[PDB]
From a paper:
The phosphorolytic exoribonuclease polynucleotide phosphorylase (PNPase; EC 2.7.7.8) is encoded in the genomes of bacteria and eukaryotes, and in those domains of life the ribonuclease plays multifaceted roles in regulation and environmental response. While the C-terminal RNase PH-like domain catalyses phosphorolytic attack of RNA, the N-terminal domain has lost this capacity; instead, it contributes to the ring-like quaternary structure of the trimeric PNPase assembly. Two recurrent structural motifs that are found in many RNA-binding proteins, the S1 and K-homology (KH) domains, are appended at the C-terminus of PNPase. The PNPase studied here is from the bacterium Caulobacter crescentus, which has been established as a model system to investigate cell cycle progression, because populations can be readily prepared that are synchronized in the cell cycle.
Caulobacter crescentus PNPase was co-crystallized with a short peptide corresponding to its recognition motif from RNase E in two different space groups (P63 and R3). The asymmetric unit of the rhombohedral crystals contains three PNPase protomers, while the hexagonal crystal form contains a single protomer. Although no electron density was apparent for the KH and S1 domains of PNPase in the rhombohedral crystal form, clear density was present for these domains in the hexagonal crystal. Crystals of RNA-free PNPase with recognition peptide (KPRRGWWR) revealed clear density for the peptide in both the hexagonal and rhombohedral crystal forms of PNPase. For the rhombohedral crystal form, eight residues of the peptide could be modelled into this density. The GWW motif occupies a hydrophobic pocket formed by the loop connecting helix α2 and strand β7, and the linker region between helices α5 and α6 on the surface of PNPase (figure 4a(i)). The interaction between PNPase and the RNase E recognition motif in C. crescentus is markedly different from that seen in E. coli. In our C. crescentus structure, it is clear that the GWW motif is buried into a hydrophobic pocket on the surface of PNPase, at a site approximately 60 Å from the position corresponding to the RNase E recognition site in E. coli. This is a fascinating example of convergent evolution, where different bacterial classes have arrived at distinct means of recruiting PNPase into a complex with RNase E.
Author numbering:
A (entry chain F), E (entry chain F), F (entry chain F): 891 to 897
B (entry chain A), C (entry chain A), D (entry chain A): -2 to 556, 600 to 613
Write the structure that this text describes.
């Protein structure tokens, strides 16, 4: 899971 | 009923030291907050960003505050107010160390306020918190949800006993011949700052590459912590301005290319502005003919374009804006004894960058008390760097040196220091101050140059002269060019800026700021090789002026007294 | 041909001291100016106001500067520049003491610049000029003609030998077990600030009520001086917005009420914004349909409305914004030893307000020199309070503590100090610093809590733990509610904010800021009784963590040395 | 291939000292830059101007920074940071000395940023760099191409052994009884600043005239250097607003003249505003009737007009705005002992200008360390001048004294100092501080007056009282008027402002600021003669209050101790 | 006499 | 030669 900007 | 949903990444024995990253207990109202521990040094780092853009922004407003609390070391402050006040030197440098590699990783086009603060809470007197602060800020930023393409890792690398040593402690640094701090992403080293005992490009580059390999574990840990604990990514798409670029390109493109082939300053301009005002008219201007794109936003896209072209013109042929080949260094003239009554003085000119540097000698009274957490100590090499606005033909506010001026002085301080004589052979305090009187690309290497000269002119027995140069890189998918002694405006036109300084035996300081992925260690190997050609050249132009120290110190001044007659009086007394 | 038309109110033997108020000689160009004398201490106070409103004001721009001139005490300043410079601690606190009760007395809706300065000209080494400064500023303000619904009187009250003593002198304060400063109108006490040796609510309230009775003579004197000497009242009517309020009420009123009955954060919002955007459309928006009222001025009136409703919802049922009963305190967790190397450390969390507090111990070198007019003296309890913006999820400028931060540190300093051990039983200097890492209502009681904990954690033999709570009141014509541990945004929604701190034996500090008339001593009696329930509760949650001091001081650090081994070495030496 | 096209004007033995002006080596990116040497003192001066006007300018934004580098004298700074920081007293005064005579020489109507910086690089311990800084800034300005109608020359003049001595050295100033610094164009003296041992108007005027003759060689040298090295003159024509002035004149002209003949404050206004709003309507307002001139730009031209008229009304009849004759001084009242516990105190009122001045006495601890390049020294006469905004019925920021406040204190310091008793006859340090409580023309002579009074009130044995007055001149082609004790708003309505202070035996300080050519030495002779009448008058009004020093110092305070009893205890001890 | 805001 | 504002 977990979705953001560090990819 | 449990408050605080703590999440930890504890695992990471990181080169024989435990690094814990904690989140969810502290500072829950910040976008990201991380209590980070390495050995027994602790900092808290937090990251906050505005959820909208101030009207008419411009640029990306990032600010970074590293700050030490003296309770971190069990002491009360020494000031008359016994509270910590304005940043110290160490606190400014560190804020700059964190800012430098974060700033470019934020998504292009994002312009909301972002603030990062890093507060030192405990200091174990061994592990520096400055590296921890970097890791911590990175961590807090990934967790925050800001459009930040990190994390960054960071590491110090020493050179002891003929080997790289990772994150050496304060006692280990005493026996190290390099102080290399690097910061990078998983893909790319992004920043290097160093002070070195005359060690070769291969060994220094080795250290960079080492830091890059060894910082990977922290990056992995930050992603692990992010994956369990990050907030919702802030949505932000940038503008497919990407489209009308193609447009205006094919149009004014051939125009702009031959525009740059014109020499004669003026005219050259002339042609460019024509090209702009042109494609401006029937393009993006909108009104009279929709549509359109908001004009003057079409300007932004143009600049991008002339930049791409300037960049291409460089890669085909090795020709620059001012007519130099990528290897050419600007004409140089260095001159000493310009202020005969001052202890030692130099004027150094490279092209349009110029520095007046004067050296004063003093005694024990003149050393600077610096009370660091880690211990209180006296400092006898001082270098103050002053960048007045008249140097770029501008007006601005005077007094009170900024982040930039503190940092340059620092980068020259690190270049010159490895080469001072020892306290035993020369018991003086040395204050150099440097006034940049013209600036157009590397005023801070100018001050390194000026400073060799001024010190030899003062009779400081430097073990070897030092010279520095500032370099840029244009990198494309089909080739790259390294630029020697960059012009100030080429500065914003490359993918990588670095400065190298050293002696005829090896480096003394390497500073790098990289804006994008893809600089291979093969490409740095070259870059450092062309710089070596440059600094040797520059050193050669400097020897025309002084070559070796004077044997004695200036008439004025001291030893102590300015008279040998008063010294002999005292001695006999 | 007489210059200067002086008018005096001399009469007022004021509790056995002569108070003169003079006007018309000095500072004739100010709106109001008063030379005020009490015994032989003299200050000049002046009041100036702009005769029109800056475009797009917002809020009411009042500023207050109290300042001491060292010639007032026959001395030259000690600084290297021998001129007075930035405000001292005492000068900041005092400016804040005058500002607090003036600010609400200015007519609602008035938003011209107003400045009050109070300059200490002579100090008799007995009568404090801070109370005189308050009276003086009040006087200058009534005389000026500004829309100020004063005057205020003010008084210090001590507790010596089992009796209230009015305006005790510097020598009298040495033997007093309370330091109570109050300020009020004829109708209402408006402000209280105090430091107390564990004395009961009844006795502290007695003191407030006393000050209120005894300050009446000054209020009477100011009116007497005003009646002979005031300038033309500045005309200023506020806006009978009073009308379309009734309008939008009946409309979105029932809507807003059940809107608040929705729980689930989000949605709750949602409903509110709907209600706004609604009555906005067909109301005040004007265009499309006149008319109208300038929209977004209709917003202001709305906020007023939801506030009235939130206020009503509270009084019917005891239910709040976050779902608590008016008596409920937010969940708490306190934790010590969080920075093991620091002399003593605590984390304290109440709801969304959090403070990291660490305590350091030092010796004679570490006491702070404060040179006051009244005498120069050393200070060994220091408390520095730091309110970074990340604590409210915001960005802002760092370094340099403001009026607000100086004042909070102060209000915790006064809470904790009555309970330190004596110099004879514990010869250390104690610096506490406190970093508010989350803030949502009372960060300054948090620091009182954290500070007990940190000090016991450091082994400071506090004679008793102390805890504090921050309280609000909703007052209407048909009833009132006292709120326990207020949320930060409830703060602007009550008629009275106070904080109470103390031990299990009685109070230690009471601070109050009242916005309107009608708080009866009956109503304060309750308010303080509910607070007592709260602080006892909070103290109970704190004992779960520490309970009593540790017996010894931290490993690091001192006594002196950090080693007992180095102490014995010295002793034997 | 020669970098640096240096141009020098070396010739100028300037009163037995060599003055070199160098340009083209240093600071090539500035508009004008001059390395200037006189003997062995060296400063660099640079001048930069914006090539366009910020939108909505207003006024002419000039800034001047003189700054000393301590390396100029072979020393490191004494501060804890060992870098130079905020301007010292000497650096502020000097920046003000350069600014004063440049500011009016810039073409009327020019409003681009202009900055001048002057940096002291070497100090020979004999020739002051402040005069060199002035000459240097002048030089850099002519060379820059800015619309500056210079150059200015400048010179110090001493009075030793009954003769003028040009640019006396630091050792020569020790034996001089005048310290006169003048600055002027070829046509006109533009500025004078001085401290004098009670010498007559004829001798002081002699010195001015001398400086004016002797500075011509530098002006000639600057023109010589300009002619070989200046940049293209910046084009800037001002506005032939000259035209519609004639227009609105003939119109509202007779109206405005009799408008001023009305007395009764109010009404008088009234009439003026009528006249404005009038010619405004059918004139410059444009819309409704073109055209037109942008109204409110027609306001500017009006003000010019009422000014010309006020100026004419004065020359015909000797009647002013407030009803005085050009010779009349405002009513005065001086009063001592106003703060009985302070060492000495005075209130001084002249018209609407008022100063509270209090004097404190202290010992060796209380002298101010000033470390100048030229040598480090202790200072025992201190005068601090405070101009709070309430004095003009305004609000503004408090703390931190500006250029203006430093400079006034200075101008009073120079007035009073020649008259202090000697260290041998009176070993005290004297700090005077002065609070201007009302200001309407010469608050700084008020502080001179107040300061005599306060010092005699403290028992300082001044050898003679001193008084000062501030004067203006209206100069036309057919006549001139000298104004006695000018009102603050007359200040911007004259061609020349000066202040004279002294004793009953002669001058002590003369300060002048001239805005235009044509003040003949004949006209100054008068001006100084009318001032003499005024200061004698003012001194007479002051003797009504004190006349002579008290014989003893105040009860509090010192000698040392405040008790004679403690002194005798010590002595016997 | 005297008419203003303190009442 | 040389043409500007100082005249």
């Amino acid at each position: 899971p977990r979705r953001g900007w560090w990819r | 009923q449990d408050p605080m949903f703590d999440i930890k990444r504890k695992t990471i024995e990181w080169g024989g030291k435990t690094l814990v990253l904690e989140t969810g207990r502290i500072a829950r109202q910040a976008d990201g907050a991380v209590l980070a521990t390495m050995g027994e040094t602790v900092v808290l780092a937090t990251a906050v960003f505005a959820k909208s853009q101030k009207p008419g922004q411009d640029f990306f407003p990032l600010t970074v505050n590293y700050q030490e609390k003296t309770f971190a070391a069990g002491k009360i402050p020494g000031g008359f107010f016994k509270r910590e006040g304005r940043p110290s030197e160490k606190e400014t440098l560190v804020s700059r160390l964190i800012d430098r590699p974060i700033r470019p990783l934020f998504v292009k086009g994002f312009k909301n306020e972002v603030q990062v603060v890093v507060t030192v809470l405990q200091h174990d007197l061994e592990n520096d918190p400055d590296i921890l602060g970097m890791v911590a800020a990175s961590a807090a930023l990934c967790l925050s949800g800001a459009p930040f393409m990190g994390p960054i890792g960071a590491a110090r690398v020493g050179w002891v006993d003929g080997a790289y040593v990772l994150n050496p402690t304060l006692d280990e640094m005493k026996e190290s011949k390099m102080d290399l701090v690097v910061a990078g992403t998983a893909d790319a080293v992004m920043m290097v700052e160093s002070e070195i005992q005359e060690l070769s490009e291969e060994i220094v580059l080795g250290g960079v590459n080492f830091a890059h390999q060894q910082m990977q574990a922290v990056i992995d840990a930050i992603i692990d912590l992010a994956e369990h604990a990050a907030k919702e990514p802030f949505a932000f798409e940038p503008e497919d301005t990407d489209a009308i670029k193609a447009k205006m390109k094919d149009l004014v493109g051939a125009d702009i290319a031959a525009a740059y082939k014109i020499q004669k300053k003026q005219d050259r301009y002339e042609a460019v502005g024509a090209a702009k005002k042109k494609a401006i008219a029937a393009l993006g201007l909108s009104d009279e003919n929709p549509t359109g794109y908001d004009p003057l936003k079409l300007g932004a896209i143009f600049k991008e374009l002339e930049a791409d072209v300037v960049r291409r013109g460089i890669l085909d042929t090795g020709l620059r804006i001012d007519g130099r080949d990528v290897k050419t260094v600007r004409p140089i003239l260095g001159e000493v004894g310009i202020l005969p009554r001052t202890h030692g003085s130099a004027l150094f000119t490279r092209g349009e960058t110029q520095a007046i540097v004067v050296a004063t000698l003093g005694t024990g009274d003149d050393e600077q008390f610096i009370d660091a957490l880690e211990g209180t100590y006296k400092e006898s090499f001082l270098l103050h760097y002053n960048f007045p606005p008249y140097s770029v033909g501008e007006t601005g506010r005077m007094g009170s040196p900024g982040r930039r001026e503190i940092g340059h002085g620092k980068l020259a301080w690190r270049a010159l220091r490895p080469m001072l004589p020892t306290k035993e052979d020369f018991p003086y305090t040395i204050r150099l101050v440097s006034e940049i009187t013209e600036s157009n690309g590397s005023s801070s290497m100018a001050t390194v140059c000026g400073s060799s000269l001024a010190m030899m002119d003062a009779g400081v027995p430097l073990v070897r002269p030092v010279s520095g140069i500032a370099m840029g890189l244009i990198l494309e998918q089909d080739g790259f060019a390294v630029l020697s002694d960059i012009l100030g405006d080429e500065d914003h036109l490359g993918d990588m800026d670095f400065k190298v300084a050293g002696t005829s035996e090896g480096l003394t300081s390497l500073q790098m700021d990289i804006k994008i992925a893809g600089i291979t260690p093969a490409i740095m190997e070259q870059a450092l090789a062309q710089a070596k050609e440059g600094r040797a050249h520059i050193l050669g132009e400097m020897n025309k002026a002084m070559d070796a120290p004077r044997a004695d110190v200036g008439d004025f001044a001291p030893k102590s007294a300015s008279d040998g007659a008063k010294i002999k009086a005292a001695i006999d007394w």
